[PDB]
Amino acid sequence: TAKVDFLKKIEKEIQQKWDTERVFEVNASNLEKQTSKGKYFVTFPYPYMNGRLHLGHTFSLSKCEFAVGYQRLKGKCCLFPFGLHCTGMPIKACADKLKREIELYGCPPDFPSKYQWGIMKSLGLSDEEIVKFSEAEHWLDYFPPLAIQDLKRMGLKVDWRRSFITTDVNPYYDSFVRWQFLTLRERNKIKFGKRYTIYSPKDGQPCMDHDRQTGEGVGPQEYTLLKLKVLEPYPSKLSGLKGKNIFLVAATLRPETMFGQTNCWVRPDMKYIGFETVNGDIFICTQKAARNMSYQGFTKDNGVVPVVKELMGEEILGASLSAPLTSYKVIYVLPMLTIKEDKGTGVVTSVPSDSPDDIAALRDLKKKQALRAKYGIRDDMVLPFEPVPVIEIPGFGNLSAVTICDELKIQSQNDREKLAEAKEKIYLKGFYEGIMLVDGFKGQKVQDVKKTIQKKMIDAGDALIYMEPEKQVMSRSSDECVVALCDQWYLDYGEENWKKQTSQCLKNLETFCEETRRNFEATLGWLQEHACSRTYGLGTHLPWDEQWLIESLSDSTIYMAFYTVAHLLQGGNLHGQAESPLGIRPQQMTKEVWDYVFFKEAPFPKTQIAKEKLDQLKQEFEFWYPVDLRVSGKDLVPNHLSYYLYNHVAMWPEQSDKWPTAVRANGHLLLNSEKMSKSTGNFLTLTQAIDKFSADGMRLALADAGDTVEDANFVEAMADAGILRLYTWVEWVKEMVANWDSLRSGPASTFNDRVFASELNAGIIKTDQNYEKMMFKEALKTGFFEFQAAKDKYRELAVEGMHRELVFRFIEVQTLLLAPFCPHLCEHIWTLLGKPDSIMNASWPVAGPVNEVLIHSSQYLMEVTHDLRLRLKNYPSHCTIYVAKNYPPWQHTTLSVLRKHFEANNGKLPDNKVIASELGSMPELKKYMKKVMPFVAMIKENLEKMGPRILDLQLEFDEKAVLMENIVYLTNSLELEHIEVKFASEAEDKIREDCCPGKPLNVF
């Protein structure tokens, strides 16, 4: 119960020792003469502050909290500073979903957790102060300070002075941003243009990834829209617009097929709309493909849909229709009753010759009279149109769609599963092997012409360009974004000579697996015009079209170097509004001033702060750059971290040594094995967990969740496993510091001492190796569970009394491995072993030699003792045990050349049909040829569990003498009286023969 309160007692105290001696602070002036093993510099991506931080936030940053704790014991100075993000609509569109809930339901509010109000009362905030949040400033007055007090109680190795806030509410960071961006105009890494990006009407701006709430990586996405003439007789429901040419509008992907046009598809219970183009004509689409067109510069008044009739395609079927590109001089509009309303325009091109949905849906209106019934389609309109050979794909003939639907045997337009895989092998095959048929292109492949076919339909005014969200994208403000076409300021992320440079920063960077380098190795290939011009959201304003703000991801890319000087400029304020310790007014640092600080070969400027101050920050910068590490989620890999490199390349143009050195992708966080969603009661915040289980326990779990890229698993049930094994360790250390009088003195020479010493030293090592590969799962595995594994064997296996000055060894070396997992615990220990310094001043306990014969031996006892505790529970008092000198007959010529198939094989023997093979053929083993492979079978499975020796005809340690050494751990925890040790050529005959060395047996 009070398992855990006790930890948080010492915890918070150490926290307030750690700060009133500023352990984790370091300054570059000081820490440059004393280069012990150099600078380590890691980073967390700073997190947006629409909230305190949650567990899956810490797991992400944990990766370094351990890292720094480990290196600074290996001999490196550590800088891991934390900054907080707010340059985003996350804070904005959160605060505003709030104020609208007040505007519409009053305050205190009244609704017909899950609402914006009912999330910040779900944090315990007074009714009077929740309303203080509507203006987004009171988020920044409020949330940044709360995060830093949160990590206080994690114990996070931070030089806190290097914090900040990120928006223009801060004057220091702000000029920094500016400098970046003056340079990127100056280096042609921004340009003004009009380009297709993904856009929120309700935001009134672009919204690339980190402004969204759906589809974090969805692209400016292309379509070919065909302009079909509605024809006289106009259908009875089209009266009014006598005044214009009225167009049906329908969005294809393969324009190269539109000769195969037979009719038009609309689902008749869908709601269409027809507007005025700026052309002056009338279109007709979904309500949404309309409002897309609009923001694409279709409607005379961009963004606004000049709707003139609402209606449902039930009123529309059967109206005559000239189509571009097809011999069917008149096609009609027909019903395909499944038309999803996400994609397209609710009006779907019909190529029955060459897509199965068309030929299927069209089969029916020909198959079933009583379908032209519910929709009154005369017989001219359906029957006589039969498909058109426009592509011939070899395998399937001219009309690849009808050909393969008579052989997938599709009955309806509703056989959907089989209509889908009909489509599969045929849409893409048609797209290379395709060769056009009808003239202009006689026999030219599809891949060639698809471009120039759509070419001629535009030029002739029969079609123009539609673009749409690939998949639906809702915004941070709950808006269905749509693909617009707009003035923006865009980063040239695709200009070749920039791309090819940074891929030499991708290759030169170190990732941690090759599913990481894979991801970027993608994103690099696709990145081009990425807008940074937001006119809405918190931020910093662009300094030459000032009306523009900066999008969250693009003011966020070289900021790390701010972490290098924020402690001298912002003095460890958060808004950096207070006065600097280095007296530089926020005004007083200008594009020349930065430039000196940040480009080595930059000239002193005529600044208004003299030389002695500004030489300082070039010293700090050039000392910690470049950035050794970034541990993020796996989710900023393709967007932020891939701009991390463009920016770093393009701003230091040749300081290759300043570029990023490493970055480690890990996955998202599972609390107790489920999506951590505040929806379903499965979610935890740092201020929530740290008070649930001691941070040193919550810390401990974290290291023990995942260290792949694959999603990690925080398991409460194991979170509490720690708070136990941790306390049961402390009250063991209290036990020895209570009982020096009973730990054996003098020489540390007992067989198990020698076992345990070279065990422990073989531990330390594995834990060094696991730590450096940053596999904190394993660093913990080897460092605690396996370190207790020996202390806990050594206590039993040595009934001779554990040695004193090899206990204090263990308590020390084990404390010292745990430092980065539990700096609080371990420091509580360190003072109580009487060291008068602090445990972040510690050094890696270098390991003594390993006596690996002395391990490979002790596995022999800790093994078979767990063996004959099985033969026992059948039924004695008086016991016997049998061994062997060399291998018995049959299994010295089994084993003598079982070798045969590895010294002249280098990797393995042949599978187990040719096992009985030519040993059965032995003049010897015909007798036991039924047990030879059973004994052969299981002695392979400890050749990847014991190493490669298991086929030496000799061991490395005297099989007996090493047992006569521990016989009394045996005659004690086995509670039999005497136990003889014979060599079994004295034994009974049934074990005289088929027991060998390593395989002992016993009488009773």
Ligand X SMILES: Nc1ncnc2c1ncn2[C@@H]1O[C@H](COP(=O)(O)OP(=O)(O)OP(=O)(O)O)[C@@H](O)[C@H]1O
Ligand Y SMILES: CC(C)C[C@H](N)C(=O)O
Site residues (vs ligand Y, CB under 6 A):
252-254, 257, 348-349, 351, 355, 357-358
Q: Burial-class residue 82 by CB neighbours within 10 Å (0-12, 13-18, 19+).
A: buried
For ligand Y, give the closer residue by CB, 104 or 420: 420
CB of 550 to ligand X, least distance (A): 15
Q: Is 47 in the site for ligand X (CB under 6 A)?
A: yes
CB of 398 to ligand Y, least distance (A): 16
Please list every residue from 959 through 998 that binds ligand X, using CB under 6 A. Answer: none
> How far is C-alpha 147 from the geometric centre of its chain's CA atoms?
23
For ligand X, give the closer residue by CB, 56 or 144: 56
- For ligand X, the binding residue among 168, 392, 635, 691 (CB under 6 A) is 635
| Interface map 639-668 toward ligand X (x if CB under 6 A) | -----------------------------x
For ligand Y, give the closer residue by CB, 65 or 357: 357
For ligand Y, give the closer residue by CB, 390 or 895: 390
Partner from ligand X, ligand Y, none contacting 77, C-beta within 5 to 8 A by type: none
Output the 3-class SS for 448-463. Answer: HHHHHHHHHHHHCCCE
Q: Is 632 in the site for ligand X (CB under 6 A)?
A: yes
- For ligand X, the binding residue among 293, 457, 627, 636 (CB under 6 A) is 636
State whether residue 310 is helix, strand or coil: strand
Torsion of CA 201, 206, 212, 218, to 10 degrees: 110
Q: Is 315 in the site for ligand X (CB under 6 A)?
A: no
Q: Is 167 in the site for ligand X (CB under 6 A)?
A: no
Residue 151 to residue 730: CA distance in whole angstroms: 25
- For ligand X, the binding residue among 60, 167, 296, 326 (CB under 6 A) is 60
CB of 356 to ligand Y, least distance (A): 8
Binding-site residues for L-leucine sit at: 46, 48, 553, 556
Torsion of CA 45, 49, 53, 57, to 10 degrees: -30
For ligand Y, give the closer residue by CB, 424 or 735: 424
- Enumerate residues 6+ apart whose C-beta is below 8 A from 13: none
Instruction: With CA atoms as reference, report the closest residue to 183 among 528, 560, 602, 513.
Output: 602
Render the burial of 245-265: b for 16+ CB within 10 Å, e for the rest.
Answer: ebbbbbbbebbbbbbbbbbbb
Partner from ligand Y, ligand X, none contacting 56, C-beta within 5 to 8 A by type: ligand X
CB of 633 to ligand X, least distance (A): 3
Partner from ligand Y, ligand X, none contacting 162, C-beta within 5 to 8 A by type: none
Partner from ligand X, ligand Y, none contacting 358, C-beta within 5 to 8 A by type: ligand Y
For ligand X, give the closer residue by CB, 47 or 206: 47
What the block records as the tokens of 387 is 């498909």
For ligand X, give the closer residue by CB, 471 or 926: 471
Partner from ligand Y, ligand X, none contacting 523, C-beta within 5 to 8 A by type: none
Partner from ligand X, ligand Y, none contacting 47, C-beta within 5 to 8 A by type: ligand X
| Distance set, CA 610 to CA 172, 569, 588, 606 (Å) | 18, 15, 11, 9
Partner from ligand X, ligand Y, none contacting 254, C-beta within 5 to 8 A by type: ligand Y
- For ligand X, the binding residue among 8, 57, 803, 999 (CB under 6 A) is 57
Partner from ligand Y, ligand X, none contacting 635, C-beta within 5 to 8 A by type: ligand X
Residue 372 to residue 317: CA distance in whole angstroms: 10
Residue 523 to residue 350: CA distance in whole angstroms: 35
Output the 3-class SS for 823-869. Answer: HHHHHHHHHHCCCCCCHHHCCCCCCCCCCHHHHHHHHHHHHHHHHHC
Residue 546 to residue 183: CA distance in whole angstroms: 16
State whether residue 194 is helix, strand or coil: strand
Nearest residue to ligand X, using CB? 56
Partner from ligand X, ligand Y, none contacting 257, C-beta within 5 to 8 A by type: ligand Y
Q: Is 162 in the site for ligand X (CB under 6 A)?
A: no
CB of 360 to ligand Y, least distance (A): 10
Instruction: With CA atoms as reference, report the closest residue to 735 among 726, 723, 725, 743.
Output: 743
**Are the CB atoms for 219 and 467 separated by under 8 Å?**
no
State whether residue 898 is helix, strand or coil: helix
CB of 116 to ligand X, least distance (A): 17
Strands (DSSP E) along 679-757, which ranges? 712-714
- Residue 1001: phi and psi, rounded to 5, are -135, 180
For ligand Y, give the closer residue by CB, 153 or 254: 254
Partner from ligand Y, ligand X, none contacting 51, C-beta within 5 to 8 A by type: none
**Are the CB atoms for 440 and 241 separated by under 8 Å?**
no
Residue 858 to residue 612: CA distance in whole angstroms: 64
What the block records as the tokens of 664 is 């480690």
CB of 210 to ligand X, least distance (A): 6
CB of 409 to ligand Y, least distance (A): 20
Find the helix or strand (DSSP H, E) in which 525 lies.
helix 516-526
Partner from ligand X, ligand Y, none contacting 85, C-beta within 5 to 8 A by type: ligand X
Binding-site residues sit at: 46, 48, 553, 556, 678
Query: Of the ranges 55-63, 492-500, 650-658, 988-996, which one interacts with ligand X (CB under 6 A)?
Result: 55-63
Partner from ligand Y, ligand X, none contacting 803, C-beta within 5 to 8 A by type: none
**Are the CB atoms for 138 and 132 separated by under 8 Å?**
yes
**Are the CB atoms for 195 and 529 separated by under 8 Å?**
yes
Q: How many CB atoms lie within 10 A of CB 951?
A: 17
Partner from ligand Y, ligand X, none contacting 520, C-beta within 5 to 8 A by type: none
For ligand X, give the closer residue by CB, 141 or 635: 635
- As a whole number of Å, the end-to-end CA separation of the chain is 46
CB of 630 to ligand X, least distance (A): 9
Q: Is 144 in the site for ligand X (CB under 6 A)?
A: no
Q: Is 85 in the site for ligand X (CB under 6 A)?
A: yes
CB of 350 to ligand Y, least distance (A): 7
Residue 366 to residue 517: CA distance in whole angstroms: 55
What the block records as the tokens of 286 is 């979904």
CB of 286 to ligand Y, least distance (A): 14
Q: Is the dihedral of CA 237, 367, 321, 355 positive or negative?
A: positive
For ligand Y, give the closer residue by CB, 254 or 828: 254
CB of 85 to ligand X, least distance (A): 5
- Identify the DSSP state of 561: G
Is the N-terminal amide bond of 626 cis, ω within 30° of 0?
Answer: yes
Instruction: With CA atoms as reference, report the closest residue to 270 among 345, 351, 376.
Output: 345
Residue 901 to residue 73: CA distance in whole angstroms: 47
For ligand X, give the closer residue by CB, 83 or 434: 83
Interface with ligand X (CB under 6 A): 45, 47-48, 56-57, 59-60, 85, 632-633, 635-636, 668-669
